[PDB]
Design an enzyme around this catalytic site. Structure first.
Site, PDB file in Angstrom:
ATOM      1  N   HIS A 285       0.826  -1.232   0.000  1.00 49.25           N
ATOM      2  CA  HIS A 285       0.000   0.000   0.000  1.00 49.25           C
ATOM      3  C   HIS A 285       0.853   1.271   0.000  1.00 49.25           C
ATOM      4  O   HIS A 285       0.367   2.363  -0.395  1.00 49.25           O
ATOM      5  CB  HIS A 285      -1.046  -0.026   1.137  1.00 49.25           C
ATOM      6  CG  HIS A 285      -0.547   0.496   2.444  1.00 49.25           C
ATOM      7  ND1 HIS A 285      -0.249  -0.321   3.509  1.00 49.25           N
ATOM      8  CD2 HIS A 285      -0.311   1.765   2.858  1.00 49.25           C
ATOM      9  CE1 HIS A 285       0.117   0.423   4.536  1.00 49.25           C
ATOM     10  NE2 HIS A 285       0.130   1.685   4.153  1.00 49.25           N
TER      11      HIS A 285
ATOM     12  N   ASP B  22      -0.829  -7.256   1.664  1.00 53.01           N
ATOM     13  CA  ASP B  22      -0.135  -5.991   1.788  1.00 53.01           C
ATOM     14  C   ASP B  22       1.372  -6.223   1.982  1.00 53.01           C
ATOM     15  O   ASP B  22       1.932  -6.011   3.062  1.00 53.01           O
ATOM     16  CB  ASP B  22      -0.730  -5.147   2.932  1.00 53.01           C
ATOM     17  CG  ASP B  22      -0.326  -3.692   2.858  1.00 53.01           C
ATOM     18  OD1 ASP B  22       0.311  -3.278   1.867  1.00 53.01           O
ATOM     19  OD2 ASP B  22      -0.572  -2.946   3.841  1.00 53.01           O
TER      20      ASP B  22
ATOM     21  N   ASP C 214       0.669   1.177  20.161  1.00 49.67           N
ATOM     22  CA  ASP C 214       0.327   0.700  18.840  1.00 49.67           C
ATOM     23  C   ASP C 214       1.371   1.160  17.835  1.00 49.67           C
ATOM     24  O   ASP C 214       2.197   2.034  18.123  1.00 49.67           O
ATOM     25  CB  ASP C 214      -1.039   1.255  18.434  1.00 49.67           C
ATOM     26  CG  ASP C 214      -1.769   0.433  17.378  1.00 49.67           C
ATOM     27  OD1 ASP C 214      -1.251  -0.545  16.797  1.00 49.67           O
ATOM     28  OD2 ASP C 214      -2.920   0.848  17.055  1.00 49.67           O
TER      29      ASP C 214
ATOM     30  N   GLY D  22       2.720   6.031   9.037  1.00 52.53           N
ATOM     31  CA  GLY D  22       4.114   6.316   8.879  1.00 52.53           C
ATOM     32  C   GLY D  22       5.018   5.156   9.265  1.00 52.53           C
ATOM     33  O   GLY D  22       6.171   5.142   8.855  1.00 52.53           O
TER      34      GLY D  22
ATOM     35  N   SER E 105       3.990   2.044   8.482  1.00 52.02           N
ATOM     36  CA  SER E 105       3.664   1.102   7.429  1.00 52.02           C
ATOM     37  C   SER E 105       4.890   0.598   6.715  1.00 52.02           C
ATOM     38  O   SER E 105       5.773   1.376   6.325  1.00 52.02           O
ATOM     39  CB  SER E 105       2.729   1.729   6.385  1.00 52.02           C
ATOM     40  OG  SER E 105       1.457   1.946   6.987  1.00 52.02           O
ATOM     41  N   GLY E 106       4.904  -0.708   6.498  1.00 50.18           N
ATOM     42  CA  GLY E 106       6.006  -1.367   5.822  1.00 50.18           C
ATOM     43  C   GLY E 106       7.146  -1.866   6.701  1.00 50.18           C
ATOM     44  O   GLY E 106       7.959  -2.705   6.278  1.00 50.18           O
TER      45      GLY E 106
END
Ligand SMILES: CS(=O)(=O)N(CC(N)=O)c1cccc(CC(=O)Nc2ccc3nc(N)[nH]c3c2)c1
Ligand SMILES: [Ca+2]
Ligand SMILES: [Cl-]
Ligand SMILES: [Cl-]
Lengths: 58, 250
Positions: free
Chosen positions: B41, B90, B182, B186, B188-189
């Site tokens: 994504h 993803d 959590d 930012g 992500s990945g």
């Protein structure tokens, strides 16, 4: 021993074989010790180890 | 990352920062000297695929200390089953234009075998997630790399405990439902890294969630074990012209 229980006693990867047989294996950059389960680095920067911490306890 | 701590410099040496025209895009995970795993994504809105940079050995974005290594991203490989604008499948595999040099500050995370990951790593309760993402929901991103220990849930329990995308077999939940801790936008990945008998392994990719640290919700991670054979086959393949490659999955 079987790979599903306790990882077959292997430190890293485990393969089941025909009969009551099991072979442990190690990732690239490691070699399997004579115990048939333990993996030891063979390179300076093996995957999944943190150099500053490995030196802190060496 | 919400509610974590600064990852001491060099203790997250597999963490990747992805930049597009110098701007922070996403995280990633180094798994070999030329290969980085990230989230599909991250690449939905890329206009110029030739300005994507991966940075290894990064820590404090405000300074240059000489341990950073930057590489152009030569290939972004995404599974055929991923659909832009959605959450399933993803994952992306990135080929760097030149290898990074392994150092005390740049080290790959081990990509586990599937069996090992499914039978053993999947039952290690806590794993680390890291990134320079938002420190709070609707908040500023981090200047120093952050890290957080999160516990994994069986999907049945995640669905039960949560109170909208499904959690598919290509995902898993991890974290806390009390709004305290959590991963966030930012991050992500980036890696969800799991320790077993002295070595760390890649088990998840930071993927999505309902807000960040939202009460009654958990972070959702790409279940990397589903992609091991797909990744391994691609790493044995020759590069193809053109940055983006869609590759059949399975
Ligand atoms: C809406 S879409 O599906 O179209 N798409 C947009 C696009 N086109 O890329 C997209 C897909 C996946 C994630 C995101 C943002 C996102 O959820 N980040 C995030 C990351 C980690 C997290 N941990 C928690 N606790 N919450 C998180 C949130 C957007
Ligand atoms: Ca820096
Ligand atoms: Cl080929
Ligand atoms: Cl191109």
């Amino acid at each position: 021993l079987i790979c599903v229980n306790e990882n077959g006693g292997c430190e890293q990867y485990c393969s089941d074989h025909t009969g009551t047989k099991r072979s442990c294996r190690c990732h690239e950059g490691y070699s399997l010790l004579a115990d048939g389960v333990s993996c030891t680095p063979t390179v300076e920067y093996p995957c999944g180890k943190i150099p500053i911490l490995e030196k802190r306890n060496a | 990352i919400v509610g974590g701590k600064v990852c001491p410099k060099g203790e997250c040496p597999w963490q990747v920062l992805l930049l597009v025209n110098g701007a922070q895009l996403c995280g990633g995970t180094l798994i070999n000297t030329i290969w980085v795993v990230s989230a599909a994504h991250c690449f939905d809105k890329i206009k110029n695929w030739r300005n994507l940079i991966a940075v290894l050995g990064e820590h404090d974005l405000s300074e240059h200390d000489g341990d950073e290594q930057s590489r152009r991203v030569a290939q972004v490989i995404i599974p055929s089953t991923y659909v832009p604008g959605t959450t399933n499948h993803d994952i992306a595999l990135l080929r760097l234009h030149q290898p990074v040099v392994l150092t005390d500050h740049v080290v790959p995370l081990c990509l586990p075998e599937r069996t090992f990951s499914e039978r053993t790593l999947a039952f290690v309760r806590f794993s680390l997630v890291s990134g320079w993402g938002q420190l709070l929901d609707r908040g500023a991103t981090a200047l120093e790399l952050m890290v957080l220990n999160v516990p994994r849930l069986m999907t049945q329990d995640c669905l039960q405990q949560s109170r909208s995308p499904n959690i598919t077999e290509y995902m898993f939940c991890a974290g806390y439902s009390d709004g305290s801790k959590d991963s966030c936008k930012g991050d992500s990945g980036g890696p969800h890294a799991t320790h077993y008998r002295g070595t760390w392994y890649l088990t998840g990719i930071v993927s999505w969630g309902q807000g960040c640290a939202t009460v009654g919700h958990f972070g959702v991670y790409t279940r990397v074990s589903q992609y091991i054979e797909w990744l391994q086959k691609l790493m044995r393949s020759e590069p193809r012209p053109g940055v983006l490659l869609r590759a059949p999955f399975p």
